[PDB]
Design a protein around this ligand. Structure first.
Ligand SMILES: *[C@@H]1O[C@H](CO)[C@@H](O)[C@H](O)[C@H]1NC(C)=O
Lengths: 34, 42
């Protein structure tokens, strides 16, 4: 899947995820919410 | 169609909504088909 080198690259850098699947739901019932 | 805003919705082709990884879709049919060269990729 994601390569381990890019696994380290992705996790080490600060990424805020803009909710590909249900990110709207992720702030209706639980920055990229506002 | 319950809680909308602006002007109302336009729908004719009655057809349940389909849950896609990008969201929830109307006006589409489920089909497990593969195309390399989509002119209009969704
Ligand atoms: C299409 O059908 C399969 C199983 O029949 C289902 O897993 C999939 O979520 C459906 N696709 C959509 C977009 O709902």
């Amino acid at each position: 899947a994601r390569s381990a080198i890019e696994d380290l690259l992705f996790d080490k850098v600060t990424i805020a995820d803009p909710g590909y699947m249900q990110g709207y739901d992720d702030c209706m019932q639980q920055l990229i919410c506002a | 169609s319950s809680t909308m805003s602006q002007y109302s919705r336009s729908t004719r082709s009655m057809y349940g909504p389909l849950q896609t990884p990008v969201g929830c879709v109307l006006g589409l049919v489920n089909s497990s088909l593969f195309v390399e060269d989509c002119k209009l990729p969704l």
